Amino acid sequence: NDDIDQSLIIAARNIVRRASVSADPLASLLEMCHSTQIGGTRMVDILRQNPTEEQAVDICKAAMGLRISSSFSFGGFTFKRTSGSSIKREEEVLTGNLQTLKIRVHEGYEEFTMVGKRATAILRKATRRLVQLIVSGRDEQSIAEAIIVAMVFSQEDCMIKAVRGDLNFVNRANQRLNPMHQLLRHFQKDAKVLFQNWGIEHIDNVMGMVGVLPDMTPSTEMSMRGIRVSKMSSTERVVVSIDRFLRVRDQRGNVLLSPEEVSETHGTERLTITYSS
């Protein structure tokens, strides 16, 4: 039933936002999920039996020890590893404003699939290197957003040095964002410099694959390095941890979800959401 899911998501998102601004968001979130009711039934009972995988929903599921999708969310996009592997190595890099950031750099060749509300992509990358990106979204803006995420996700030096400012982004709870999100929010405010310094190259026009330029204009002759455009599976469930501030981590310690990665809501629920604590 799609009506339950639509309302569950709407409820989950509101709960995570309202909990995130608490002193102990995890406690606050557990209180809200126990008493809030969707269409009569208690929410806890829905999470236990509902198959929906969503950022806010999987946060709530994780909060009560339920298995969730191994995939992780970054910049709104759901990354699933199709091939390859990497390992973590806390490096320290230098931005284009001489600000130092301690970043978890991933070493190894990986293949991914990015999925978003308004764009998808296949992303090949390796140690601080974007090999290939085949984005395919709704329109210009939705596709640019997907490329910005890919560039920041790649951890390439040109992207790091493309920073032109001091990164002091905070969240609803007025806490500093972790490095990778600091970079992301900066290049979402304006990706002008990022796209210039990324670099262009000559492309060999193949069907479907169309190139794109730093101004977001196509070309069958030249495109940006590794980035192509186009037009148009199973789920592994795994145990996950959650801490005070609703940061969900897999066993290997990588942040799968956080309040920072939940979308905004439309708030036209088909079922009855009574928010009790």
Ligand SMILES: O=C(O)[C@H]1[C@H]2CC[C@H](CC2)[C@@H]1Nc1nc(-c2n[nH]c3ncc(F)cc23)ncc1F
């Ligand atoms: O590293 C983390 O703790 C999180 C942070 C928020 C989302 C992202 C990006 C940073 C990351 N989560 C995860 N990242 C990765 C990953 N694999 N290969 C990568 N290359 C660069 C990168 F940058 C992250 C990754 N694999 C599993 C994850 F679960």
